[PDB]
Write a protein that binds this ligand. Structure first.
Ligand SMILES: N[C@]12C[C@H]3C[C@H](C[C@H](C3)C1)C2
Lengths: 25, 25, 25, 25
């Protein structure tokens, strides 16, 4: 398993790419 | 748990979304 | 090991650097 | 212990913030 602060920071990263891919889209 | 350079890069990522969110106000 | 969301976000980031060193190689 | 693709992914993270403290306030 990974640290929680880490799983958070990633979710923040994964959601960013989405809002990007919609902003662009 | 999770490797510390990986807790590092994270504290930076979260803190970054903070400064940014704040940058709008 | 490290959670999957983190191995996912990471692949993005490594693939992010990749899409750069090329866009400007 | 975090995945390697993840420990790597974060050197390029910690290496970004560095090029940054090296540019602006
Ligand atoms: N930008 C990221 C920092 C750290 C490593 C990787 C996954 C998470 C945690 C988000 C990219």
């Amino acid at each position: 398993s990974s640290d929680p602060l880490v799983v958070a920071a990633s979710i923040i990263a994964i959601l960013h790419l989405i809002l990007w891919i919609l902003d662009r889209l």
